[PDB]
Amino acid sequence: EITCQENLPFTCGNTDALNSSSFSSDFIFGVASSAYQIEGTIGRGLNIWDGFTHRYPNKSGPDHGNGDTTCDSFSYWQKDIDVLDELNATGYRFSIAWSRIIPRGKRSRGVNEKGIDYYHGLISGLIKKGITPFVTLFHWDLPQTLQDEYEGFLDPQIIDDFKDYADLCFEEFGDSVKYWLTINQLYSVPTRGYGSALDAPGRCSPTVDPSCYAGNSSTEPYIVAHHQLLAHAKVVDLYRKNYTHQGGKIGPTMITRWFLPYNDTDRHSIAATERMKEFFLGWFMGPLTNGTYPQIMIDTVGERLPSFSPEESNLVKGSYDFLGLNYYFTQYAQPSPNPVNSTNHTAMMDAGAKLTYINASGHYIGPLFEKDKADSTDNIYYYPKGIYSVMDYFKNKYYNPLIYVTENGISTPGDENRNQSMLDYTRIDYLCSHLCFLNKVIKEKDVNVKGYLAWALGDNYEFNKGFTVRFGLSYIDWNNVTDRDLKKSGQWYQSFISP
Ligand SMILES: *[C@@H]1O[C@H](CO)[C@@H](O[C@@H]2O[C@H](CO)[C@@H](O[C@@H]3O[C@H](CO[C@H]4O[C@H](CO)[C@@H](O)[C@H](O)[C@@H]4O)[C@@H](O)[C@H](O[C@H]4O[C@H](CO)[C@@H](O)[C@H](O)[C@@H]4O)[C@@H]3O[C@@H]3OC[C@@H](O)[C@H](O)[C@H]3O)[C@H](O)[C@H]2NC(C)=O)[C@H](O[C@@H]2O[C@@H](C)[C@@H](O)[C@@H](O)[C@@H]2O)[C@H]1NC(C)=O
Numbered sequence: 221e222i223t224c225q226e227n228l229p230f231t232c233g234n235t236d237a238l239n240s241s242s243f244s245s246d247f248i249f250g251v252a253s254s255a256y257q258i259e260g261t262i263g264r265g266l267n268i269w270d271g272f273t274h275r276y277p278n279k280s281g282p283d284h285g286n287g288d289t290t291c292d293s294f295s296y297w298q299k300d301i302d303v304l305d306e307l308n309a310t311g312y313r314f315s316i317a318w319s320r321i322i323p324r325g326k327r328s329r330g331v332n333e334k335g336i337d338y339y340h341g342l343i344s345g346l347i348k349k350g351i352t353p354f355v356t357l358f359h360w361d362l363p364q365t366l367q368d369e370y371e372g373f374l375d376p377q378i379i380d381d382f383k384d385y386a387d388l389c390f391e392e393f394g395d396s397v398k399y400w401l402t403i404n405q406l407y408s409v410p411t412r413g414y415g416s417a418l419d420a421p422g423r424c425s426p427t428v429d430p431s432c433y434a435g436n437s438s439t440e441p442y443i444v445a446h447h448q449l450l451a452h453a454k455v456v457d458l459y460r461k462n463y464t465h466q467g468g469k470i471g472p473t474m475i476t477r478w479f480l481p482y483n484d485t486d487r488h489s490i491a492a493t494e495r496m497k498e499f500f501l502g503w504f505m506g507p508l509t510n511g512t513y514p515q516i517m518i519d520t521v522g523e524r525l526p527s528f529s530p531e532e533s534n535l536v537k538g539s540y541d542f543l544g545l546n547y548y549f550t551q552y553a554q555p556s557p558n559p560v561n562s563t564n565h566t567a568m569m570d571a572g573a574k575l576t577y578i579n580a581s582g583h584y585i586g587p588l589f590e591k592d593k594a595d596s597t598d599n600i601y602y603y604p605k606g607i608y609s610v611m612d613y614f615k616n617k618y619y620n621p622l623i624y625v626t627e628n629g630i631s632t633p634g635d636e637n638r639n640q641s642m643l644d645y646t647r648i649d650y651l652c653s654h655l656c657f658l659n660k661v662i663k664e665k666d667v668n669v670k671g672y673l674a675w676a677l678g679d680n681y682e683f684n685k686g687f688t689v690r691f692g693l694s695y696i697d698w699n700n701v702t703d704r705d706l707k708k709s710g711q712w713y714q715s716f717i718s719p
Pocket residue numbers: 506510511512513514515518519527
């Protein structure tokens with residue numbers, strides 16, 4: 221019987237109690253990263269994250285930091301491999317910058333052979349060290365030209381352009397890459413990029429944020445989400461019909477969260493909690509497993525929710541070999557009004573729920589996840605059991621899918637000096653507490669999880685936060701980004717992997 225801790229202090233940092241041997245022999249352990257966050261603009265065209273961070277510096281991060289140079293993985297990709305080698309990692313998730321291989325967006329406009337070579341070198345290097353690549357085709361960095369031509373994912377033209385880009389990736393890298401992720405965190409761009417405008421491209425309703433150049437927070441998130449599903453499905457169909465000889469697998473990336481009732485004895489809170497599962501997870505999982513949006517979304521969103529044609533429904537349904545599940549935290553849900561007529565209405569309001577980290581009786585869900593200096597009441601807290609609940613839910617609700625945890629991690633303040641940043645015991649606690657529960661859910665619920673990739677191989681530009689927070693298991697000095705030095709967490713993970 222496996223017992224896992226939910227509150228501080230944690231004792232899972234002892235590799236004598238918890239290690240890779242606790243999992244199946246073939247279980248993959250590694251770390252993850254994304255192109256915009258680690259490469260730098262050198263050698264690539266411009267994308268919407270360059271555009272967004274430059275047009276709206278205040279939105280790039282409190283420090284106005286962006287991905288211009290960041291940790292310079294373009295030049296130091298070998299150093300990334302060295303970190304993985306040091307960790308004895310068996311997996312590495314990275315993303316291909318569309319702007320690096322097709323700077324002009326549309327494939328017919330030509331490709332960047334040097335950009336293609338960059339990824340060939342990285343992939344060859346990973347394989348030579350026994351590291352299995354998990355490659356994300358689209359980690360939000362859409363070529364700026366496509367956003368300017370037709371507003372990217374807001375238009376159906378994105379489908380063919382994404383398909384042609386994916387085709388190039390399969391053609392060029394598919395002989396070596398056997399695990400593909402289509403779109404990173406399906407929920408994110410529709411809501412943050414077209415709803416709240418916290419993320420690129422930065423579209424929203426005029427009253428939601430006067431700085432948005434255009435948009436409609438009430439309708440656009442649904443249009444974008446719909447196109448993401450269609451684009452994703454078209455790419456999966458292309459992969460399975462034209463690249464089956466490669467013997468690989470492909471799937472979407474979902475940002476997952478668990479939800480608990482703000483008040484577990486209040487039917488309204490309980491209902492809001494179930495609505496959140498449907499609006500947050502079901503919005504994409506319903507189409508992916510059934511070819512239709514959840515009924516509660518159909519009923520609530522009405523005319524603002526696009527419909528799948530019979531052909532599209534068939535294309536989207538079952539469009540995955542596995543699911544890349546990112547997991548960070550869990551929230552309490554309570555009822556909230558949905559003012560559809562208000563000029564400030566956002567798609568996020570349709571769920572009719574308010575999310576918190578403290579419940580009705582004043583209980584904080586778990587240890588501190590992220591401290592918000594602007595407002596103490598806006599602090600995020602984590603919940604280790606959430607990963608168990610999410611995996612159990614996916615197996616029972618979404619037809620026992622093959623799963624790879626594609627992201628799981630925690631940040632530490634950017635204000636900390638080198639020594640403080642290196643002594644990241646809070647990260648060991650976060651990682652081990654989640655790994656305990658992941659092992660527990662695999663054994664108790666038989667969830668088909670075959671890999672775990674911790675977020676951020678190293679410190680990098682964090683979307684919306686600049687360099688004010690660090691997520692890496694390895695430290696990076698912003699005055700000399702060459703070195704990737706394993707922090708206490710990286711050293712612990714090394715021992716966890718090879719006890
Ligand atoms: C997994 O996918 C399944 C489909 O492959 C889902 O089952 C479908 O669920 C639909 C509801 O979402 C359901 O469609 C409704 O059908 C009603 C009856 O239509 C028949 O009878 C009519 C007689 O007058 C006739 O005119 C029709 O031609 C049909 O013969 C219909 O009245 C409904 O329309 C109203 O409600 C919808 C909102 O749901 C409104 O959009 C619409 O304007 C109207 O107000 C509705 O029809 C749909 O209307 C919208 C239109 O775009 C669609 O083309 C049209 O179908 C449908 O019958 C079933 N199909 C099957 C195979 O059972 C399944 O849904 C779950 O299970 C069903 C049974 C139901 O309980 C749902 O609530 C569940 O979510 C999906 N499962 C999951 C997990 O989501």
